[PDB]
Swiss-Prot record, chain F:
Keywords: Acetylation, Cytoplasm, Nucleus, Proteasome. GO terms for cellular component: nucleus; proteasome complex; proteasome core complex, alpha-subunit complex; proteasome storage granule. It comes from Saccharomyces cerevisiae (strain ATCC 204508 / S288c) (Baker's yeast). The proteasome degrades poly-ubiquitinated proteins in the cytoplasm and in the nucleus. It is essential for the regulated turnover of proteins and for the removal of misfolded proteins. The proteasome is a multicatalytic proteinase complex that is characterized by its ability to cleave peptides with Arg, Phe, Tyr, Leu, and Glu adjacent to the leaving group at neutral or slightly basic pH. It has an ATP-dependent proteolytic activity. Present with 12000 molecules/cell in log phase SD medium. Belongs to the peptidase T1A family. It is found in: Cytoplasm; Nucleus. The keyword Cytoplasm applies. This is Probable proteasome subunit alpha type-7. The keyword Methyltransferase does not apply. GO terms for molecular function: mRNA binding. The gene is PRE10. The alpha and beta forms are probably products of the same gene with different post-translational modifications. The lineage of its organism: Eukaryota, Fungi, Dikarya, Ascomycota, Saccharomycotina.
Curated annotation (Swiss-Prot), chain G:
The 26S proteasome consists of a 20S proteasome core and two 19S regulatory subunits. The 20S proteasome core is composed of 28 subunits that are arranged in four stacked rings, resulting in a barrel-shaped structure. The two end rings are each formed by seven alpha subunits, and the two central rings are each formed by seven beta subunits. The catalytic chamber with the active sites is on the inside of the barrel. Belongs to the peptidase T1B family. The chain holds residues 20 to 130 of 241 of the full protein. This is Proteasome subunit beta type-6. Non-catalytic component of the proteasome which degrades poly-ubiquitinated proteins in the cytoplasm and in the nucleus. It is essential for the regulated turnover of proteins and for the removal of misfolded proteins. The proteasome is a multicatalytic proteinase complex that is characterized by its ability to cleave peptides with Arg, Phe, Tyr, Leu, and Glu adjacent to the leaving group at neutral or slightly basic pH. It has an ATP-dependent proteolytic activity. The gene is PRE7. It comes from the Eukaryota. It comes from Saccharomyces cerevisiae (strain ATCC 204508 / S288c) (Baker's yeast). It is found in: Cytoplasm; Nucleus.
Curated annotation (Swiss-Prot), chain H:
This is Proteasome subunit alpha type-6. It comes from Saccharomyces cerevisiae (strain ATCC 204508 / S288c) (Baker's yeast). Transmembrane segments: none annotated. Pfam families: Proteasome, Proteasome_A_N. Gene3D superfamilies: Glutamine Phosphoribosylpyrophosphate, subunit 1, domain 1. The proteasome degrades poly-ubiquitinated proteins in the cytoplasm and in the nucleus. It is essential for the regulated turnover of proteins and for the removal of misfolded proteins. The proteasome is a multicatalytic proteinase complex that is characterized by its ability to cleave peptides with Arg, Phe, Tyr, Leu, and Glu adjacent to the leaving group at neutral or slightly basic pH. It has an ATP-dependent proteolytic activity.
Curated annotation (Swiss-Prot), chain I:
It is found in: Cytoplasm; Nucleus. It comes from Saccharomyces cerevisiae (strain ATCC 204508 / S288c) (Baker's yeast). It comes from the Eukaryota. GO terms for molecular function: endopeptidase activator activity. One of its GO terms (biological process) is proteasome-mediated ubiquitin-dependent protein catabolic process. Signal peptide: none annotated. Belongs to the peptidase T1B family. This is Proteasome subunit beta type-4. The gene is PRE1. Keywords: Acetylation, Cytoplasm, Nucleus, Phosphoprotein, Proteasome. The lineage of its organism: Eukaryota, Fungi, Dikarya, Ascomycota, Saccharomycotina. Non-catalytic component of the proteasome which degrades poly-ubiquitinated proteins in the cytoplasm and in the nucleus. It is essential for the regulated turnover of proteins and for the removal of misfolded proteins. The proteasome is a multicatalytic proteinase complex that is characterized by its ability to cleave peptides with Arg, Phe, Tyr, Leu, and Glu adjacent to the leaving group at neutral or slightly basic pH. It has an ATP-dependent proteolytic activity. This subunit has a chymotrypsin-like activity. The modification N-acetylmethionine is found at M1. Present with 21800 molecules/cell in log phase SD medium. InterPro entries: Ntn_hydrolases_N, Proteasome_beta2, Proteasome_bsu_CS, Proteasome_sua/b, Proteasome_suB-type.
């Protein structure tokens, strides 16, 4: 087996392979998550350097880890599949031994743990992936949104964004999200999510994806149809 | 230019480490020669004991591999002994597995295949030696098969190895172009040894005492090396010209 | 701590070249010319036996090798690499085919195995590619006669006729002129001897030329009778004499 | 490159020294050890106002009688804490007793130097391990990724540590009460933190022989910040 | 030690790219263009070969189009040898699924495992990635007809029409131009050739430099036939569409 | 260049520079000799006294292998010990299978092949010692000297370390002026002298003499240390000849 | 068939006082109807004010006592010369015995 | 220069720079002294605090009842080597019912250090040790150096400014070698020797560490209030 | 543990599974569900050695649930039964084989037809109109052979089962403390909450 230490310290006290893994995330298509008062919404930019795509069969950018937790990501698509697979296996393993589905914090801590392990293991590079992990703990209606990054650090967010032009939309949400007043309705939270993407996303076309997770394993994704109805509506609210 | 340090190709499709291993071959500054009789194969190598503190009997580049196979080495002694021990192990194992004595040309191929591996795998360095195997094979008669660091091997009518190899080769080439046969047309191994030492003296243009030579003889069912006295006897007969 | 080389010694350069495969092909280019021709009722592979010394007995060093009773191989490039590849090619024909199906592998299947061994030297840790290109000529009941070329990359292509090594460019032009899809084997042997004269500088006779056919079955070469469905090997190396016989009507 | 386990001509391990630079970049952590208990305090340092500050876990329980504060690459501490907890719980199973704070620390510190061509690099995190045992009472230990650990009456680690440590050198005496130490940690944190110390961007904890290791709730700390600001207005 | 001679195939650039993946993609861009077009009633795979000598054996050959099972085929762009390693893996992986579930493998699951292998070579093992891109043309009874591509990175995506190899920028524009969803197989066949005709790097686009395959609904209804065109059938479909 | 940075790399000359660099560490070491005698061998070595804080008699450098073999070496001491430990494993394993204790030529090749093996890979360093060893087998006495390359021969006498040239020349004298044979007790005195003569080059510090011998008549074919009385006799003989 | 166990007889007796404890055993070692020794002690001072006897099969008995005595030694080394509590010793011995659950020490242990 | 990349590389002069760099970490280490009569062997070690709020790095480790060592340099390496030595002492005790010869402890330590200096991806130990022990041939003192060089001495010192103590002991040789039957006089001589290696700061209660082993003395460590008697 | 039955009717599969759990001399429990839901439209009942049955059933359940998440798709009952057979056929040449017999009752949503699979611990699978494991078959197969018709309603199936359970309660020596009945149809899995 290949032994080489690829993630090592530099004289300034930085681990360049981790920091370069973040550069891969920076380049990744934008992803955003927003806590409602009793929902979480995951929004995802999808680049339009290519049409003639088949979107029935192309990997969707939000993945179910269990029936009550979802995971979106920014960065290397191939790398994300490995993290998703491990997380889905760990979720079934947790159910099998603890006789309870994972808490979002636990599933996050697991994925974060995998990401970290690759930052101090021989013969592996870190994951070029940051993740948003969103859902509801079992028999709990308080929503959960966590972020992980190639270093393996993870934390909870009222709302957060990752990938290209995420500094733009983090500035938007910082400005447009009251913690004292979270988006009370589903529609309200979905709206704020689309709005933040429209700072960055070009057109409303098949450029945006929204997935909405409600409590008790109530996960459904919106079709262009129903997102267009927000894109149409927010456009006609710019008339000041 | 790290393609010069390990056995990977240079841009002109060359393995420099294999080429440099050939240069180590001549580092001992010894010349060896091998010819075939009707009944025998004779190997002769120069014996140089520079230091007086050396026990001259322990200084040898000829090895008795098996009952039937003898091997002479052109190259440094540590690589020579490494190669010898291996061929001894390989010839013993072959006998145990397949129920008959390992032929000269098969051991040569086997040792050449081992040499080939060092030219392809990076962590193994080639051995800086050329291995001249001699026997009287039970199927093929008197045999000379020779191996180099490149993993190349071929059978020889006769052969020479060392710095002065080219002079010894053309000398032997000329004898065979003339005599017009595969071998030294001689009855006794004693007279094929005499032939070998003679054509070594002519090609090198130098004279040998009994301690300047090392001789090995392969016959049917035993390969043996001559003592100082068996050579001295043989040198004395060469005097009658 | 012996083998630390568990990483590829063949990697992609910024231009997308695989340096060590290109260099292995360069090593083949320097190699002595070898060629193969498909006739309608046989295949011929041939090469020059360039001697290192006149004291070398060049019948001992065989460049054309039997792989199965119906498959032969020849090469240009590094002889030692060819030797160990023939050994692995013969064994893989048994371990991963004959020991399973009780019959020898068809030409393209055995070629596929040889190619696979050469591809692994192109990717596996701590090894250089093989410095040879093989021409593998063989017959199998359900494909008839065929000829394949295997390169250091592990790529293989089927040929009507081709050559490799030194004077391949020259010879490939010669073969194009003279090849038709109605050649009887004897005609292809003759053409192969003409094509090989061009590239051979020194002596050109039965002792400096190695030539084998994949032709008719040879009961005389089988070694036993009593089984009516074992008719013997289609691979036959032409003798020193048999080559010189044809160099008359040249 | 060069070996991962190689010495500088000075006679120090490059990869250990470079990890020490990573720890200096980390958020501040302070421990003060008193005869009434040991106090651990950390700067949380939320990187944005949107991230929920109480999800930042830089003080962590090891056993009921041992706590841990960290500074540096905090993801690197997952496995150090895991090992420490396992070591503490394991020792209890084998000996039906609490495991000495020094023995715990030594166990954690054995991990630190098991790296090179075992993990690929040293840890990018220093730990303040603070606990109580019957034999040596209240203890604070500083566990570096060099494999060395020092016992401290008080110690600061992270970006604020050079100033904070000289500040602790002044104010620490052998007769500090717990309440004094709690305030003193709040004081020195507020003094070195970039942003302004409140009960959301800083966190407290202590370990008493009586009630073991407790992380203070935001409400409890908020009232100690009031008590601190009031106190410094006087004189 | 040996560290000296290690390229480190599985590291990031300071920009967070994988040097060896990028250089493998550069390698593939000099390979014969392969095109996949998915119709309503089938899929077309068209592959353009490299310059070929007269002596090269025309008919009994398939360097670009390989069968994975009865319902799935791939078009290759890159090193043929690297592709055959990955193909035999995929063929086995398809047979394992069949033995386990007594059902033909869904096209995506096969595509994912191959992509996950490629991914592995980019993250661990210190070996060079596979210098191969695949166009997967396959049918299953969940999504019907599916077109995919996978590249050395381990990334894979779904397509209505796609090209890999040389002049894919040029080819992707021509396909984006003349492709529509209702399009039938025989239209897609014609588009595939027209596209290679315009993007080829030699003047004549003759039958002898083309490999061609279709996966059709056409059979005894409900079942799927997979056709790797004989050279005479490529000569016919080239005369029929009036390119010769 | 770059040819000298990795062990087991051939230079364009055909040399392994790392083995040649190993030899420099040997030459840098204290002097050590072997004198082969009538029915045995004698080993002597120069032990530099850094300080009177060295306990005399107590930092032994000559090592026994099996019962019947003496080993002494110049250069990196740890490397020498590691090679003897290997020699001991080799001799134990030979005795175990073949019952007879290992012959000296057989034993020499065991060290020869092992040391040579550390010139085959870039992942190991060559041995920083030349080893003079030997003893009495069923075919009489053997003296051997082995170098970092794995090169070894049988010797009449041999020397290595700083004082290798003086010793070398002083051995050459004995080979000429005693052609028929040197006795065991003779070689012990002669060994003491040559170490004193070769101390010329390590003139800086004064030293402690250490002799061992393996004689068929005098030690019964076993390796024993020359202690107490017969040591002081040979020390005295040597003091007399540097006057 | 090889029987790895034997029975060396003997009898041991532990009584706890208010501020003392006795651990007694006969000094006779037997196999079948033979006496091996009339004085072979099987009650040992393991250090840290602890006495131990493993009665039954003397080989397993001596193996266990020896292992526990070593356990005391390493407790000192690893926990800064801390005195091993009788309860801590008891628990340690459980793990020694249960370590061979599927090839037991054929001994009755009293400390 | 180019030849200090790792331990498997010789310099053209024939040196192992990685070993010399390891040797260097010892001289940065706080001074420790060893000396012994015919009846006792003493270690005095000057301990180094990190700052005014820190403990004093313990420099003396017990290996058996009859053996133990003091360290200068990387303390984790001293832990590994002391722990290895404990096992060898323990092995000799369990298998052969035999207290391990101090001279053999030397050979095992030497042979362990050597393995780390000859093969790829390793690193020399970055610590020097002084090993005292009363065995079956009297009192012993050993100086271990991570090159693998182990030497039996009457006295010595290693670490920062250790040259001072080392010359005092070189002078006082005949005084201390005949402190037989007196434990305190043999320690006093050691505390005087270690004082030749001080500057600015000198021996307080909790910066000084003394170990003694001998004829009727189990290897024991004296710290804090139990060294005040010697300041 | 003891008796497990299955019958496929017009458009559902009915699994009846004994409620008794006996540890030697005592009936420890009289309300045990010898069933796991593998997917929303697939139910497995199991009987055999203690511990292995729950361990095997839960292990299959986790594997099928993992597949569902990964592909966002429910495997056909045929595919699940083929997977389960392979696991058992795997385990029979293990060091310690799973000692578990199973009935897999599933509604194939893609084919709108109910399917019942009987697999023993050897990995011997058959698709059956009605199935049982162990001694259950010997009593009930005569009743089912007679009364069974491929086009029966669910309530007809339950009535034929009621007869089967009655004959068992009459002639079985062991008191199996009645059965828990479950129905698998196009709308999923539900429990007939008394018998
Ligand atoms: Mg090599
Ligand atoms: Mg059955």
């Amino acid at each position: 087996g290949y032994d080489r230490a690829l993630s090592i310290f530099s004289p300034d006290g930085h681990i360049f392979q981790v920091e370069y893994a973040l550069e891969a995330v920076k380049r990744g298509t934008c992803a955003v998550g927003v806590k409602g008062k009793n929902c979480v919404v995951l929004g995802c930019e999808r680049r339009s350097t290519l049409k003639l795509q088949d979107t029935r069969i192309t990997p969707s950018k939000v993945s179910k880890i269990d029936s009550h937790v979802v995971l979106s990501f920014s960065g290397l698509n191939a790398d994300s599949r490995i993290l998703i697979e491990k997380a889905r296996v760990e979720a079934q393993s947790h159910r099998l031994t603890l006789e309870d589905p994972v808490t979002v914090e636990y599933l996050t801590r697991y994925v974060a743990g995998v990401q970290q392990r690759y930052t101090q293991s021989g013969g592996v590079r870190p994951f070029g992936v940051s993740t948003l992990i969103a859902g509801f703990d079992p028999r709990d209606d308080e929503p959960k949104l966590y972020q992980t990054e190639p270093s393996g650090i993870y934390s909870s967010w009222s709302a957060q964004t990752i990938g290209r032009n995420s500094k733009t939309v983090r500035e938007f949400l910082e400005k447009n999200y009251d913690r004292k007043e979270p988006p009370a309705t589903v529609e309200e939270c979905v709206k704020l999510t689309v709005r933040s993407l429209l700072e960055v996303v070009q057109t409303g076309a098949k450029n945006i994806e929204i997935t909405v997770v409600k409590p008790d394993s109530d996960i459904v994704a919106l079709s262009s149809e129903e997102i267009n109805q927000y894109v149409t509506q927010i456009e006609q609210e710019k008339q000041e | 230019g790290y393609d010069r340090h390990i056995t990977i190709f240079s841009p002109e499709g060359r393995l420099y480490q294999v080429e440099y291993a050939f240069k180590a071959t001549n580092q001992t500054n010894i010349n060896s020669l091998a010819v075939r009789g009707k009944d025998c194969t004779v190997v002769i190598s120069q014996k140089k004991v520079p230091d007086k503190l050396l026990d001259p009997t322990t200084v040898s580049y000829i090895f008795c591999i098996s009952r039937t196979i003898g091997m002479v080495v052109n190259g440094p002694i540590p690589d020579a002994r490494n190669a010898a021990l291996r061929a001894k192990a390989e010839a013993a194992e072959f006998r145990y597995k397949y129920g008959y004595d390992m032929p000269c040309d098969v051991l040569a191929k086997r040792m050449a295949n081992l040499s080939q591996i060092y030219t392809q795998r990076a962590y193994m360095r080639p051995l800086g030696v050329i291995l001249t195997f001699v026997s009287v094979d039970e199927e093929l008669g008197p045999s000379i098969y020779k191996t180099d660091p490149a993993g190349y091997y071929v059978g020889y009518k006769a052969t020479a190895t060392g710095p002065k190899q080219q002079e010894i080769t053309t000398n032997l080439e000329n004898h065979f172009k003339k005599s017009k046969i595969d071998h030294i047309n001689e009855e006794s191994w004693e007279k094929v040894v005499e032939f070998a030492i003679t054509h070594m003296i002519d090609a090198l243009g130098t004279e040998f005492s009994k301690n300047d030579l090392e001789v090995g003889v392969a016959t049917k069912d035993k390969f043996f090396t001559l003592s100082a006295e068996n050579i001295e006897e043989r040198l004395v007969a060469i005097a009658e010209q | 701590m012996t083998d630390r080389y568990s990483f590829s010694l063949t990697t992609f350069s910024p231009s997308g070249k695989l340096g060590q495969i290109d260099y292995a092909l360069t090593a083949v280019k320097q190699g002595v010319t070898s060629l193969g021709i498909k006739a309608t009722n046989g295949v011929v592979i041939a090469t020059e036996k360039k001697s290192s010394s006149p004291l070398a007995m060049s019948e001992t060093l065989s460049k054309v090798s039997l792989l199965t009773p119906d498959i032969g191989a020849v090469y240009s490039g590094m002889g030692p690499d060819y030797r160990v590849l023939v050994d692995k090619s013969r064994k893989v024909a048994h371990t991963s085919y004959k020991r399973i199906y009780g019959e020898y592998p068809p030409t393209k299947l055995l070629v596929s195995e040889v190619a696979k061994i050469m591809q692994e030297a192109t990717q596996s840790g701590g090894v250089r590619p093989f410095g040879v290109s093989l021409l593998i000529a063989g017959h199998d009941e359900f494909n008839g006669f065929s000829l394949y070329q295997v390169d250091p990359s592990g790529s293989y292509f089927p040929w009507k006729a081709t050559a490799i090594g030194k004077g391949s460019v020259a010879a490939k032009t010669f073969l194009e002129k003279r090849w038709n899809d109605e050649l009887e084997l004897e005609d292809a042997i003759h053409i192969a001897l003409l094509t090989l004269k061009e590239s051979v500088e020194g002596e050109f006779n039965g002792d400096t030329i190695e030539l084998a056919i994949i032709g008719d079955e040879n009961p005389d070469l089988l070694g036993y009778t009593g089984i009516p469905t074992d008719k013997g090997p289609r691979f036959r190396k032409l003798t020193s004499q048999e080559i010189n016989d044809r160099l008359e009507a040249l | 490159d060069r070996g991962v386990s190689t010495f500088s001509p000075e006679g120090r391990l490059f990869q250990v020294e470079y990890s020490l630079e990573a720890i200096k970049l980390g958020s501040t952590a302070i421990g003060i050890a008193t005869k009434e208990g040991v106090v651990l305090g950390v700067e949380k340092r939320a990187t944005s106002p949107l991230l929920e500050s109480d999800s930042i876990e830089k003080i962590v329980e090891i056993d009921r009688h041992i706590g841990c504060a960290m500074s540096g690459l905090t993801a690197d501490a997952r496995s150090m804490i895991e090992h420490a907890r396992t070591a503490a719980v394991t020792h209890n199973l084998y000996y039906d007793e609490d495991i000495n704070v020094e023995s715990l620390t030594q166990s954690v510190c054995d991990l630190a130097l098991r790296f090179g061509e075992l993990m690929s690099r040293p840890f990018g995190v220093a730990l303040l391990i603070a606990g109580h045992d019957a034999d040596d009472g209240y203890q604070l230990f500083h566990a570096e990724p060099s494999g060395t650990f020092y016992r401290y009456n008080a110690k600061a680690i992270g970006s604020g540590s050079e100033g904070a440590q000289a500040e602790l050198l002044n104010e620490w005496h052998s007769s500090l009460t717990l309440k004094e130490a709690e305030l003193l940690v709040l004081k020195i944190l507020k003094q070195v933190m970039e942003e302004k110390l409140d009960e959301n961007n800083a966190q407290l904890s202590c370990i008493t022989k009586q009630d073991g290791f407790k992380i203070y709730d935001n409400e409890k700390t908020a009232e100690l910040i009031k008590e601190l600001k009031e106190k410094e207005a006087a004189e | 030690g040996s560290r000296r001679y290690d390229s480190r195939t599985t590291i990031f650039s300071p920009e967070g790219r994988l040097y060896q993946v990028e250089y493998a993609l550069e390698s593939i861009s000099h390979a014969g263009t392969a095109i996949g077009i998915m119709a309503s009633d089938g899929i077309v795979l068209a592959a353009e070969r490299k310059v070929t000598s007269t002596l090269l054996e025309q008919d009994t050959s398939t360097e670009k189009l390989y069968k994975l099972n009865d319902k799935i085929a791939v078009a290759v762009a890159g090193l043929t040898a690297d592709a055959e390693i990955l193909i035999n893996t995929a063929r086995i992986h398809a047979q394992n699924y069949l033995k386990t579930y007594n059902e033909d493998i869904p096209v995506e699951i096969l595509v994912r495992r191959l992509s996950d292998i490629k991914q592995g070579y980019t993250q661990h093992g210190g070996l060079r990635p596979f210098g191969v891109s695949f166009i997967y043309a396959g049918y299953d009874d969940r999504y019907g007809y599916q077109l995919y591509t996978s590249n050395p990175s381990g990334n894979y995506t779904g397509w209505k029409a796609i090209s890999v190899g040389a002049n894919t920028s040029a080819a992707q524009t021509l396909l984006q131009m003349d492709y529509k969803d209702d399009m039938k197989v025989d239209d897609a066949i014609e588009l595939a050739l027209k596209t290679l005709s315009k993007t080829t790097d030699s003047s004549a686009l003759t039958y002898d430099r083309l490999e061609f395959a279709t996966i059709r609904k056409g059979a005894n209804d409900g079942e799927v036939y997979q056709k790797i065109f004989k050279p005479q059938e490529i000569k016919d479909i080239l005369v029929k569409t009036g390119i010769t | 260049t770059g040819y000298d940075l990795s062990n087991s790399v051939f230079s364009p000359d055909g040399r392994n520079f790392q083995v040649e660099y190993a030899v420099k560490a040997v030459e840098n070491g204290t002097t050590s000799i072997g004198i082969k005698c009538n029915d045995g061998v004698v080993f002597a070595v120069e032990k530099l006294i850094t300080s009177k804080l060295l306990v005399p008699q107590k930092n032994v450098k000559i090592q026994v292998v099996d019962r019947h073999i003496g080993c002494v070496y110049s250069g990196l001491i740890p490397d020498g010990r590691h090679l003897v430990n290997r020699g001991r494993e080799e001799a134990a394993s030979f005795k175990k299978l073949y019952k007879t204790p290992i012959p000296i030529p057989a034993f020499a090749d065991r060290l020869g092949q092992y040391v040579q093996a550390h010139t085959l890979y870039n992942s190991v360093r060559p041995f920083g010692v030349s080893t003079i060893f030997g003893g009495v087998d069923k075919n009489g006495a053997h003296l051997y000297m082995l170098e970092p390359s794995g090169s070894y021969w049988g010797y009449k006498g041999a020397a290595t370390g700083k004082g290798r040239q003086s010793a070398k020349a002083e051995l050459e004298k004995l080979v000429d002026h005693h052609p028929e044979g040197l006795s065991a007790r003779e070689a012990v005195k002669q060994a003491a002298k040559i170490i004193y003569l070769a101390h010329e080059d390590n003139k800086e510090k004064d030293f402690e003499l250490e002799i061992s011998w393996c004689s068929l008549s005098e030690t019964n074919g076993l390796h024993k240390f020359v202690k107490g009385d017969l040591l002081q006799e040979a020390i005295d003989f040597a003091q007399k000849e540097i006057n | 068939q090889f029987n790895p166990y034997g029975d060396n007889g003997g009898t041991i007796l532990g009584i706890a006082g208010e501020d003392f404890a006795v651990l007694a055993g006969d000094t006779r070692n037997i196999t079948d109807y033979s006496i091996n020794s009339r004085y072979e002690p099987k009650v040992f001072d393991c250090g840290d004010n602890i006495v131990m006897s493993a009665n039954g099969f003397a080989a397993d008995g001596d193996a266990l006592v020896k292992r526990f005595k070593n356990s005391v030694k390493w407790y000192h080394f690893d926990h800064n010369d801390k005195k091993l509590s009788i309860n801590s010793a008891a628990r340690n011995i459980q793990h020694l015995l249960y370590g061979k659950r599927f090839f037991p020490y054929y001994v009755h242990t009293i400390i | 220069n180019n030849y200090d990349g790792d331990t498997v590389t010789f310099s053209p002069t024939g040196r192992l720079f990685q070993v010399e760099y390891a040797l260097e970490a010892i001289k940065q280490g706080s001074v420790t002294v060893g000396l012994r009569s015919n009846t006792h062997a003493v270690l005095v070690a000057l301990k180094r605090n990190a700052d005014e709020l820190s403990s004093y790095q313990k420099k003396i480790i017990k290996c058996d009842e009859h053996m133990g060592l003091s360290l200068a340099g990387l303390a984790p390496d001293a832990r590994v080597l002391s722990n290895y030595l404990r096992q060898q002492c323990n092995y000799s005790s369990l298998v052969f019912n035999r207290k391990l010869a101090v001279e053999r402890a030397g050979h095992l330590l030497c042979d362990k250090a050597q393995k780390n200096t000859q093969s790829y991806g390793g690193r020399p130990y970055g610590v020097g040790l002084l090993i005292i022990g009363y065995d079956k041939s009297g009192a012993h003192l050993l100086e271990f150096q991570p090159s693998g060089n182990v030497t039996e001495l009457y006295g010595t010192a290693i670490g920062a400014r250790s040259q001072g103590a080392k010359t005092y002991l070189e002078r006082t040789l005949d005084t201390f070698i005949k402190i037989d039957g007196n434990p305190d006089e043999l320690i006093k001589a050691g505390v005087e020797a270690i004082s030749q290696s001080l500057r600015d700061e000198s021996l307080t209660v909790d910066n000084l560490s003394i170990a003694i082993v001998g004829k009727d003395t189990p290897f024991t460590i004296y710290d804090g209030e139990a060294v005040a008697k010697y300041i | 543990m003891d008796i497990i039955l299955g019958i496929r009717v017009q458009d559902s599969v009915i699994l009846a599974s004994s409620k008794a759990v006996t540890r030697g001399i005592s009936v420890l429990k009289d309300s045990d569900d010898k069933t796991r839901q593998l997917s929303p439209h697939t139910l497995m009942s199991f009987a055999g050695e203690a511990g292995d049955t729950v361990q095997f059933a839960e292990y299959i359940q986790a594997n099928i649930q993992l597949y569902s998440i990964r592909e966002d798709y429910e495997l056909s009952p045929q595919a699940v039964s083929s997977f389960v057979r392979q696991e058992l056929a795997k385990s029979i040449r293990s060091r310690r084989p799973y000692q578990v017999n199973v009935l897999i009752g599933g509604y194939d949503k893609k084919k709108n037809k109910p399917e019942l699979y009987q697999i023993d611990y050897l990995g011997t699978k058959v698709e059956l109109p009605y199935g049982a494991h162990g001694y259950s078959g010997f009593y009930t197969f005569s009743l089912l052979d007679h009364h069974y018709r491929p086009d029966m309603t669910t309530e007809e199936g339950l009535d034929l089962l009621k007869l089967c359970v009655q004959e068992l309660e009459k002639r079985m020596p062991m008191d199996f403390k009645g059965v828990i009945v479950k129905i698998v149809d196009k709308d999923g899995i539900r429990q007939v909450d008394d018998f």
